[PDB]
Amino acid sequence: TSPRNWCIKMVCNPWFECVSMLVILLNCVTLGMYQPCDDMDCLSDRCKILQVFDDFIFIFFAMEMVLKMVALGIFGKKCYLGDTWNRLDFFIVMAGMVEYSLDLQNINLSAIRTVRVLRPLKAINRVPSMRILVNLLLDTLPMLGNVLLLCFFVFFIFGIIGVQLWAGLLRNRCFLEENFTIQGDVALPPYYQPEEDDEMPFICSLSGDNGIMGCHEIPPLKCVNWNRYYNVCRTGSANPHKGAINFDNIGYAWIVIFQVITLEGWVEIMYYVMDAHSFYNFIYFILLIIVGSFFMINLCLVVIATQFSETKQREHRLMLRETRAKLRGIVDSKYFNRGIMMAILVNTVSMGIEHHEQPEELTNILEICNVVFTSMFALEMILKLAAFGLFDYLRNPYNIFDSIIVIISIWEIVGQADGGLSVLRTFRLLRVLKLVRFMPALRRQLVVLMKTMDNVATFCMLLMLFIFIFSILGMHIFGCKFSLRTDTGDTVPDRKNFDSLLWAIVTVFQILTQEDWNVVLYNGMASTSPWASLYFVALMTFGNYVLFNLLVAILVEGFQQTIIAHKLFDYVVLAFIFLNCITIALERPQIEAGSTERIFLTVSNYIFTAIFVGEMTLKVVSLGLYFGEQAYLRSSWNVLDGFLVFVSIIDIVVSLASAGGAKILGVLRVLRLLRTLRPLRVISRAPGLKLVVETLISSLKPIGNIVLICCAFFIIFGILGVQLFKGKFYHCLGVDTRNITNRSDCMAANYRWVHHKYNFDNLGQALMSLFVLASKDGWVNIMYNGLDAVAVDQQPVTNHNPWMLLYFISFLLIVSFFVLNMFVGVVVENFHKCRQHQEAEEARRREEKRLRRLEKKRRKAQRLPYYATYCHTRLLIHSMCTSHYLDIFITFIICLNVVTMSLEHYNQPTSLETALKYCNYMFTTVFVLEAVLKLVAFGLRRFFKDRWNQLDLAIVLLSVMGITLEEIEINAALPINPTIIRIMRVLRIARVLKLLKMATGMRALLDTVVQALPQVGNLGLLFMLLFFIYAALGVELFGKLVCNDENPCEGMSRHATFENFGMAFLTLFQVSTGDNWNGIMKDTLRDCTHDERSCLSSLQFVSPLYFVSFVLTAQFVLINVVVAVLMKHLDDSNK
Ligand SMILES: CC(C)CCC[C@@H](C)[C@H]1CC[C@H]2[C@@H]3CC=C4C[C@@H](OC(=O)CCC(=O)O)CC[C@]4(C)[C@H]3CC[C@]12C
Ligand SMILES: CC(C)CCC[C@@H](C)[C@H]1CC[C@H]2[C@@H]3CC=C4C[C@@H](OC(=O)CCC(=O)O)CC[C@]4(C)[C@H]3CC[C@]12C
């Protein structure tokens, strides 16, 4: 119409979108200047100005809303409420108008104020790239519901188990004796807590409940030992972590299960439960880890990648001076370039030598060498423009880069006054990048990475917007509520706070890395309310398990002599090597000399070595060492066999040379380490492991270039970290550690001059610290030390240099990018192998696939006995009572069962317990009635043929068994121990399984998992073998590291120490999860107070190698497991 006409022109004018984006950005700026810790009710000039612009912004938003209203119409596809995002604009407009109106009525209620945060979310509409990305994301979300329902199953099952077992067990501490008589001066707490205000509680075990630690394990206090008086323990207090970790409700059990899904703080609560209830809850936690933290979030990744690929295809389917000549020959020689390459490489090596407490003369040689080098590059500069000319020089931009390098270098040389020596020193590292001009494959790899980054940019903006909105939300709801209680005269704010936008963004980034996020969860959820955990749940879920799976999908679909007896010999030797593994699993550093077991191990070693020598001799006489082709040593496995047997025999002869063992004990150590490597021939003696190792090594080469690039950035950032932090990683740990500036005052107060274990003194230490950072574990402490750094020999101060966030966060982002590139490279590499073999046999399967369709033609009607029950009193049962009409009632009763089992908690009222008993009775009645009606509906044939009514009968049988036993508790007919009653109550959870029949998508997804079990099973076997090797090796290396008060451990707390084989297998499992593994490796590399030679041994060289190798190998195996599942998923999708 005419009124629409005078306005519609501006609406589709792109300058309208431009000015809209300008006001959106101005609004984001105004939201970014919130200071909840200081902005108390807007009594400031800045607050007034910000409120004024907020009013102006609201005026403009209302104007644009109403104008697009009078230009599009209402309630129609073409109308204003046509886009999803226009409805959102409507919502912000109404919400802000309500907020303003309530401000008019003197009802502030800054809980409608927090709706501001959704205002930046309108910018998704005004960036068309963001519109497209978010549109595909939202259109692929609705197919994520299947894995969301699997998530619900694994949360509900484990939550019910937890609330049934450990409801209120977390609350019990060791209290004083009931009638405690004291002379006076009441100072004892009612119970025992080691650190002030329940920093680490002392959760006991009740009498009757066979826990582990039971109030007689209290460390005696060293006046009189007060801790011996804490005799009895009862279940009344607050429960740990400021009432945050418990199993009272089912909401709290969900919180704890979500904490162990993210693999953070897992072991601490595992030991909580072990102390409170029983030793055998590690089964619960291991199964929860394997099912949830590995087969849930990775199934989320698989489903999101596949669904995003499918959405990409779907929307795509809708569309479908004579020396100048002579001087050149030296230049383009392909050999002078190699000489200058050695020049640059030794320049890099020279830059790497520098370290802390560097000798006076060595650094002097370093500057001399730098001058020589830069003279060489300047000579190259002069030469290559003379024989070429200026324009020929400027043709290649690598020449521009080299010119910048040479000018920066020469400027740095002559700038020996100030400025140059401090920053142009940092620009020295750019000479390392010149190597890209020389490796041809690395040009191609970085070109591929730039091809990817063409599409990562829009995702980076979307992630930046997500982090901004969530940081502003955190500022609003967690502003100035994190203040730690006073310990030195004042309440210092927590480092992981929300007091300002910078700290909000860094803390949200930390949470997205899921490192120490549980600390922030506790500190914030105990401050506002227990419902505040929804903020972190929403943030972590949408970030890690939606947005990052989206990025992974973006990358993957942007890329896309005598006789021979050899019948049962291998199996007999396989049994023998298994027995060797069994006898390897006992060589703990605890059996005393001359033991009965020691003699057994020696004799077993002798016999096993003899048997393996016999095996080698038979193989070699069958083949010959290297006497011609197809000999013994022409396969890698056979070389490993010969190597192992030589190691064993040399170890035997050296052990028999024990007379005079001085200076050869190191040889003994090395040969014992190789004994621990020995249980490895299983790979050669098994087909599945051999093929899987071949597949691993085949899938490792293509990502070789990306691994090399990642190592190059590791070296570059290591040198940069050395430059930035030389001796700044020292701190004076003491009782005060306050009002002291430099270490001189530290020695005056005699506290200690402690040196952080993860520092940047050397370049090796820089590399170890950078690996710890890259593993996203313990990286927050390293970042804190970085920000605190001041200079060589004075105390670091809190947030001294907030500019190092750039270094420490850019490193994490770049390494994560390279790790995703490795993952996607592995996926596409496997995609080529699978696709080749797929087309042949699937076409061969399709020939037989249509035969099964012909088989269904036979299935038409084999005179089913539906009449046999007709007119036989089952006329209404077989047909009218077997359709979907009855299963909706049954699934409804199952849902009622679920919502009833979700009500038990600690100290539930007796009336609620009786109501639940009545509900359980009703559920038993309905299950029995359904089962009987089915049995009467059809004959006993399909009662077993269905493979499902069997499970239904099992559930009904357990339920009826349980209800009678609780009835036995009414008359007390026979005293039934509580164990069986509790077991059948907790087995009542099995009635959830009836939801599986209706969930066809769950069955399909879990099946698609199932036909991956060949590959997944062999990989799991190899993964367990990897644990076996590394566990034996860790027992031999680390078994003597004592863990006690004199040696304060950090990662090996109670059962994680490397003493025995199993107690080390547990800590290898924990390191595999990356939970405080950096703490474990800090524990291993530890100089002791001369109670052992190991602390003075070569541990510093070998423990980082041990842990780095283990973590990398474990992560690689898990990556390939996930890849195999993804491949079965895609292949199933194609058919
Ligand atoms: C889409 C949902 C699932 C995640 C998006 C996050 C927010 C929309 C939700 C999740 C967490 C919720 C918060 C959970 C805890 C709190 C603390 C709670 O604090 C108080 O009660 C203080 C007393 C008062 O203010 O009257 C107020 C509700 C609030 C802000 C909730 C506001 C709405 C939040 C931020
Ligand atoms: C001289 C005495 C008093 C101290 C011994 C020095 C060690 C503390 C330093 C010197 C060399 C350093 C090593 C230099 C090289 C590395 C490789 C590094 O491997 C990596 O993580 C980088 C490869 C990658 O992750 O991509 C592991 C740390 C390590 C073994 C360093 C461990 C610590 C070492 C042994």
Ligand SMILES: CC(C)CCC[C@@H](C)[C@H]1CC[C@H]2[C@@H]3CC=C4C[C@@H](OC(=O)CCC(=O)O)CC[C@]4(C)[C@H]3CC[C@]12C
């Ligand atoms: C089938 C193979 C491939 C894997 C199974 C081997 C291990 C899982 C088993 C076999 C040997 C067992 C170990 C045998 C010896 C020890 C030392 C043993 O220590 C004691 O007897 C002292 C305990 C005390 O003093 O109370 C504790 C069990 C433990 C760790 C066992 C842990 C579990 C082990 C390693």
Ligand SMILES: CCCCCCCCOc1ccccc1C(=O)Nc1ccc(C(=O)OCC[N+](C)(CC)CC)cc1
């Ligand atoms: C220079 C351009 C930068 C472009 C941005 C790149 C985003 C960088 O990635 C982050 C950026 C900011 C904050 C956190 C992260 C991060 O890495 N999150 C996070 C992801 C996965 C997990 C996890 O366990 O799944 C395991 C998944 N793999 C593959 C195993 C299967 C191992 C990764 C935990 C945590």
Ligand SMILES: *[C@@H]1O[C@H](CO)[C@@H](O)[C@H](O)[C@H]1NC(C)=O
């Ligand atoms: C530390 O220095 C401050 C500065 O005046 C002083 O007040 C205080 O007494 C000193 N000692 C301690 C333990 O704080």
Ligand SMILES: *[C@@H]1O[C@H](CO)[C@@H](O)[C@H](O)[C@H]1NC(C)=O
């Ligand atoms: C160490 O700190 C004290 C305290 O201000 C200062 O007086 C002194 O100059 C500093 N440097 C030293 C002792 O080398």
Ligand SMILES: [Ca+2]
């Ligand atoms: Ca972690």
Ligand SMILES: [Ca+2]
């Ligand atoms: Ca951690």
